[PDB]
C-alpha cells in the first residue's frame, strides 16, 4: 500500500491550484512513514513536492502549519542524511600498516613508507570527520532546538480539530527527539567532545524547550548513564566531571 | 582514597573513591537517582567559580529528579524550588551581547554573578 499513497501525491502536485492540499497531504503521508522510520520513503515523497511549492502558495490555520510541518520534516530528514554519511565515514578509518616481523631489508623500506603514508591518511580522516561532525551537529540542533515553538509543534492555534494529526505530532516528538538526542550524544562522544555531551542535560531539561517531557522515565536514566560515560573520559583527561579545570 | 585521588578494578576503587562530590556519579550508577538529585543540587549551590557549570549541574540535578521515583507531590516540590533557581540564573543568562564584548567578558568562562 506504500505506492498507493506515494502515488496520490503526483496527482495533487500536477494541478498547481491544489498545492496547499498537496503539501498538507504530503505531510500526513510523511507522518506515517516517519513513525516507521522509512526515510527513503519519506524523502521520495519529499522530492515530489516541487522545490518552489512554499513560494507560490502564499493564510488559513491549515496552511501556516503545513508549511511549518514540512520544514520541520526537512530539518528531521537532513538530520539523518548527514549522520549516515558521518557514520559511514567513522567506519572507514585508515587501517594500520601490517607488520612483517623479521623483515628483509626490502620489506623494511616498503614499510617505512606504508607507515608514513598511513600517518597522512589518518590526519585527513580526522579532517573530513571534523567537517562531517561540524555539519551533522548543526542539523541535530536545528531539530532539537527548532526555531519558534519546538519541533512538530504548531505555531498557529486557530485551525479546526484534527486529532489524528495532532496526536501524530506528539508521537513523532516522543519517537524522534529521544532518538536524535542519543545520536548527538553518540556523535559528541565519538569525536571526544565530552564537555558538550554533558551540556545535553541543559538543552533537555531547559524550560525554554521542555524537551524532558518528550522523554519516558527510562529514556532519561539511559541518557544519564550516557553522560556519566562522557564524564569518565573527562576524568581520565584530568578535568572535573563536567570538563572544567581542577584548580 | 586520598592516595588514589592525588595520583577496571580501579573503577571498583573508583566506585569507593567517587564518595565525595563525585557522589552523584556512583549514585546514577547505583540507580540511586533521588540521591543523585540532592547532591547535584548541593554542588550547584556552592558553585561560584563557573557560571556555565552552575547551569549544567542544575540541569543534571533536574534530569536526575525527573528520572527518579518521587511521588507526584514531592516531584512537584523539587521542580518548583528548582524553577526558582532557574529564575534567578536566567537573569545573568540574558545579559546583552553588546556589553559583554564591551566589558571584554568571557562568554562561558565567567563566574556566578550576584544580584
A242 touches chain B (CB under 8 A): yes
User: How was this structure obtained?
Assistant: cryo-EM
Residues in chain B: 115
Q: Report helix, strand or coil for A36.
A: coil
Tell me which chain B residues have a C-beta less than 8 angstroms from the C-beta of A209.
Answer: none
Tell me which chain A residues have a C-beta less than 8 angstroms from the C-beta of B86.
Answer: 207
CA–CA min distance A190, chain B (Å) = 21
A241 touches chain B (CB under 8 A): yes
- Whether A228 and B49 lie within 8 Å, measured CB to CB: no
A172 touches chain B (CB under 8 A): no
Which site among A185, A203, A205 would you substitute to test the B interface, given the most B Cβ atoms closer than 10 Å to its Cβ? A205
Give the nearest chain A residue to B58 (CA atoms).
A202
Is-contact A74 A46, C-beta < 8 A?
yes
Is-contact A109 A42, C-beta < 8 A?
no
Q: Report helix, strand or coil for A43.
A: helix
Is-contact A208 B89, C-beta < 8 A?
no
- Give the rounded distance of the alpha carbon of A60 from its chain centre: 30
Q: After which residues is chain B broken (C to N over 2.5 A)?
A: 7
* CA dihedral (B43, B44, B47, B51) positive or negative: positive
Q: At what angle do helices A19-34 and A2-14 cross, to 10 degrees?
A: 160
Distance in angstroms (rounded) separating the CA atoms of residues B48 and B110: 10
CA–CA min distance A154, chain B (Å) = 26
B95 touches chain A (CB under 8 A): no
Burial-class residue A113 by CB neighbours within 10 Å (0-12, 13-18, 19+): exposed
Distance in angstroms (rounded) separating the CA atoms of residues A106 and B107: 57
**What per-residue string of b and e applies to B65-75 under the rule 16 or more CB within 10 Å gives b?**
bbbbebeeeee
Q: Which residues contact A9 (CB under 8 A, 6 or more apart)?
A: A22, A25, A26, A29, A45, A48, A49
A228 touches chain B (CB under 8 A): yes
Distance in angstroms (rounded) separating the CA atoms of residues B32 and B62: 14
Is-contact A188 A197, C-beta < 8 A?
yes
Residue A163, all three cell numbers:
486529532
CA–CA min distance B31, chain A (Å) = 8
Amino acid at each position: 500500500e506504500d505506492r498507493l499513497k506515494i502515488d496520490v501525491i503526483d496527482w495533487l502536485v500536477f494541478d498547481p491550484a491544489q498545492r496547499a492540499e498537496a503539501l498538507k497531504q504530503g505531510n500526513a503521508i510523511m507522518r506515517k512513514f516517519l513513525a516507521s522510520k522509512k526515510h527513503e520513503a519519506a524523502k521520495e515523497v519529499f522530492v515530489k513536492i516541487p522545490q518552489d511549492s512554499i513560494a507560490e502558495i502564499y493564510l488559513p490555520a491549515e496552511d501556516d502549519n503545513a508549511i511549518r510541518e514540512h520544514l520541520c520534516i526537512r530539518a528531521y530528514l537532513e538530520a539523518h542524511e548527514t549522520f549516515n554519511e558521518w557514520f559511514k565515514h567513522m567506519n572507514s578509518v585508515p587501517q594500520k600498516p601490517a607488520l612483517i616481523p623479521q623483515p628483509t631489508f626490502t620489506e623494511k623500506v616498503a614499510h617505512e613508507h606504508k607507515e608514513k603514508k598511513y600517518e597522512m591518511d589518518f590526519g585527513i580522516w580526522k579532517g573530513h570527520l571534523d567537517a562531517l561532525t561540524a555539519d551533522v551537529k548543526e542539523k541535530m540542533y536545528n531539530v532539537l532546538l527548532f526555531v519558534d515553538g519546538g519541533w512538530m509543534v504548531d505555531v498557529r492555534e486557530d485551525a479546526k480539530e484534527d486529532h489524528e494529526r495532532t496526536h501524530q505530532m506528539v508521537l513523532l516528538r516522543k519517537l524522534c527527539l529521544p532518538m536524535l538526542c542519543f545520536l548527538l550524544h553518540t556523535i559528541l562522544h565519538s569525536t571526544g567532545q565530552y564537555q558538550e555531551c554533558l551540556q545535553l542535560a541543559d538543552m533537555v531539561s531547559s524550560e525554554r524547550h521542555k524537551l524532558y517531557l518528550v522523554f519516558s522515565k527510562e529514556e532519561l536514566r539511559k541518557l544519564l548513564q550516557k553522560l556519566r560515560e562522557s564524564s569518565l573520559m573527562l576524568l581520565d583527561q584530568g578535568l572535573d566531571p563536567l570538563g572544567y579545570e581542577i584548580q | 582514597l586520598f592516595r588514589w585521588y592525588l595520583e577496571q578494578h580501579g573503577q571498583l576503587a573508583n566506585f569507593l573513591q567517587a564518595h565525595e562530590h563525585l557522589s552523584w556519579l556512583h549514585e546514577i550508577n547505583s540507580q540511586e537517582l533521588e540521591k543523585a538529585h540532592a547532591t547535584l543540587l548541593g554542588l550547584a549551590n556552592m558553585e561560584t567559580r563557573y557560571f556555565a557549570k552552575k547551569k549544567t549541574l542544575l540541569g543534571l540535578s533536574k534530569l536526575a529528579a525527573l528520572a527518579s521515583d518521587f511521588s507526584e507531590d514531592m516531584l512537584q516540590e523539587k521542580i518548583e524550588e528548582m524553577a526558582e533557581q532557574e529564575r534567578f540564573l536566567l537573569h545573568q543568562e540574558t545579559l546583552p551581547e553588546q556589553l559583554l564584548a564591551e566589558k571584554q567578558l568571557n562568554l562561558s568562562a565567567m563566574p556566578v554573578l550576584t544580584a
